């Protein structure tokens, strides 16, 4: 009755530690990952302090080693000050994250010249991912070409963006992309229900035509990734709502529902949650690691999933068919039927495994 | 000084056992694979007897288990009689092989309707690969669409074929392809030297414009695979030369030379010899498995490589930069500097590993 899947990978999560641990920490965020059938996560650098230099990465690595319940890699973040300074630690990171749109954070880049500097100085064999919306996609693609290397575009959300990427792929350009579940399963039609606080996310929810274009262009999507971005309900409904949705616990049930409806195949899902994450980010296999899912059980998403400290979900009320029943991680039962059974600290930094270093010429 | 690579995969080898063991057997062919930095091979079904039914597959599996030195999967072959009969054994095979052009073998299909029957009856979640040259590529793509599934095109050799595949990918069609080293590193310009016997291969050597088009369209190539097709020199130079070249021992040195010249990157190589083979064929990781190569050593390909029983090579006289120094397979030293150190029978059928079954809906 159960379907065995390999260990799934989410290349885009915000786990809030250090410095935002009321929103989530490594222990709670990785519990949510395991409950969502995810055994490896790549954590974004917009923490407090942000992971923009070697001391901050060293702290984050120890916090993750002590708190993570699944395996992980940590991104470095590009800043206005750190181009040319990350060479000694770069290979220990998941990749470099460029935040190219609106942020108040120390990740703000004020000029395309700063993007060029990062593309020129970051080691050429290591991943670069970008938060790049609308015309920014075209702009960062131009920088990538000028510097003759690849780029991965995070959370593609619009017809405009997926068609631009499609055209770049048709020209043989080295660009990959990911799409998040909210941009496949929610739209403007849902803003009335969510309200303007809860509904706040970047990239914003798309029109129905945006959603339909992402589905029609599934072939262009290399990865699914949650952009798990936990904030509490008080923050989402307060005066200055921060953008982002929690998503680890709902991503796989939503996508399994689509598989059951024939909207994409099981293989299409596994390419996008396993094989393509591995190959774009050079992430190693996990021995003795698998996920068992039940595809027959129908349930309704509640007002909050059990594990994320966000303690809310924008998918409340959607009917899904697909449940995570058991997760085994490196030979140990990590999750069964609503209970996480590996402690904080069971998870490891995959970039420290011999098989997890990115291959490079001498 | 040495570069560590993951265990490379060759999805297209002819190992001649059962029934052609003067040309190669599992033990000699897998020794050649290991010496070429390959730790997993997918063996084609055009043996004697051909692997076209369950009894023949059972024999071949035991011969491979007893003789193979690296890990493997075995293809089933489509025949004019076996559509609808392979369902119980299909999941144990690498995939189904369709030989769509000229053959005298029991793999000859005489009608496109027989291709349709195979596409309709072979389990939809399992791989199908085709030997399809020139217009046959377009024809089998049509059959795939009619049956709404994917296909993988073997040894793409021509500008015509790579551009057709490029156009299909631009339309979002589920097609992947592989290219063999002889179609990247040899051309018509080499037929004078090779002669009409040794030079016989299918698909035939291309023009210089064919070769240049494959390089220019590297983005369209999903995999490299040798089409290792050993025949003895007596056969190649005799009255009725069979088509095919040996290639396991020369593939990686040729491609490492191209990497050293900047013609493609190390990552481009590893996508095509590791990640994409894994994901197209659902081949499992190999624990504690890696290849160490030396990129500085220049050498000239001799008149025959050490291991293949073909005892000749069409690349004789080419200068290469790139050598396999050490192979470790599942924790054991399998090859060092010209000596194979695992015995016949060390290799295993990866389709019998729990992680090597192709995932499917219940
Ligand atoms: Zn983002
Ligand atoms: Zn991302
Ligand atoms: Zn994000
Ligand atoms: Zn890799
Ligand atoms: Zn062939
Ligand atoms: Zn092939
Ligand atoms: Zn062949
Ligand atoms: Zn797979």
From Swiss-Prot, chains A, B:
Changing residue 103 to A: what effect? Abolishes dihydroorotase activity
Region listing for DHOase (dihydroorotase), in residue ranges: 1-329
Role summary = Multifunctional protein that encodes the first 3 enzymatic activities of the de novo pyrimidine pathway: carbamoylphosphate synthetase (CPSase; EC 6.3.5.5), aspartate transcarbamylase (ATCase; EC 2.1.3.2) and dihydroorotase (DHOase; EC 3.5.2.3). The CPSase-function is accomplished in 2 steps, by a glutamine-dependent amidotransferase activity (GATase) that binds and cleaves glutamine to produce ammonia, followed by an ammonium-dependent carbamoyl phosphate synthetase, which reacts with the ammonia, hydrogencarbonate and ATP to form carbamoyl phosphate.
Q: What is the effect of changing residue 14 to A?
A: No zinc-binding and no catalytic activity
* Catalytic site positions: 227
Query: Where is Zn(2+) 2 annotated to bind?
Result: 12, 154, 178
Gene it is expressed from? CAD
User: Which positions are annotated as binding Zn(2+) 1?
Assistant: 12, 14, 97, 227
Which residues, renumbered to this chain, carry the PTM N6-carboxylysine? 97
* Name of protein: Multifunctional protein CAD
Residues that, per the record, bind Zn(2+) 3: 97, 131, 155
Consequence recorded when altering residue 12 to N: Abolishes dihydroorotase activity
Q: Where in the cell is it found?
A: Cytoplasm; Nucleus
Write out the similarity annotation: In the N-terminal section; belongs to the CarA family. In the 2nd section; belongs to the CarB family.
Q: How is it modified after translation?
A: Activated by MAP kinase (Erk1/2) phosphorylation just prior to the S phase of the cell cycle, when the demand for pyrimidine nucleotides is greatest, and down-regulated as the cells emerge from S phase by protein kinase A (PKA) phosphorylation.
- Organism of origin: Homo sapiens
Known consequence of changing residue 131 to N?
A: No catalytic activity
């Amino acid at each position: 009755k159960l379907v065995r899947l390999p260990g799934l990978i989410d290349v885009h999560v915000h786990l809030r530690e250090p410095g935002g641990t009321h929103k989530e920490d490594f222990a709670s965020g990785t519990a949510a990952a395991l409950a969502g059938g995810i055994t490896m996560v790549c954590a974004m650098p917009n923490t407090r302090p942000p992971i923009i230099d070697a001391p901050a990465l060293a702290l984050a690595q120890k916090l993750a080693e002590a708190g993570a319940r699944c395996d992980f890699a940590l991104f470095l973040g590009a800043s206005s000050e750190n181009a040319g300074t990350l060479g000694t630690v770069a290979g220990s990171a998941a990749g470099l994250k460029l935040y190219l749109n609106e942020t108040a954070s120390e990740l703000r880049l004020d000029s395309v010249v700063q993007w060029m500097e990062h593309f020129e100085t970051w080691p050429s064999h290591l991943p670069i991912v970008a938060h790049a919306e609308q015309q920014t996609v075209a702009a960062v693609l131009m920088v990538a070409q000028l510097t003759q290397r690849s780029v991965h575009i995070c959370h593609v959300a619009r017809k405009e963006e997926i068609l631009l990427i499609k055209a770049a792929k048709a020209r043989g350009l080295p660009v990959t992309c990911e799409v998040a579940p909210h941009h496949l399963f929610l739209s403007h039609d849902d803003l009335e229900r969510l309200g303007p606080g809860k509904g706040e996310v970047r990239p914003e929810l798309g029109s129905r035509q945006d959603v339909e274009a992402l589905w029609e262009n599934m072939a262009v999507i290399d990865c699914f990734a949650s952009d798990h971005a936990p904030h509490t309900l008080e923050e989402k409904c307060g005066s200055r709502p921060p953008p982002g949705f929690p998503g680890l616990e709902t991503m796989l049930p939503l996508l399994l529902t689509a598989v059951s409806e024939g909207r994409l195949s099981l293989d299409d899902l596994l390419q996008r949650l396993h094989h393509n994450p591995r190959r774009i980010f050079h992430l190693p296999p996990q021995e003795d690691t698998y996920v068992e899912v039940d595809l027959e059980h129908e349930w309704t998403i509640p007002s909050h999933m059990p594990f994320s400290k966000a303690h809310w979900t924008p998918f409340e009320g959607q009917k899904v068919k697909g449940t995570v029943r058991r997760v085994v991680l490196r030979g140990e039962v990590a999750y069964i039927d609503g209970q996480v059974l590996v402690p904080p600290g069971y998870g490891q930094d995959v970039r420290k495994w011999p098989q997890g270093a990115v291959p490079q010429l001498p």
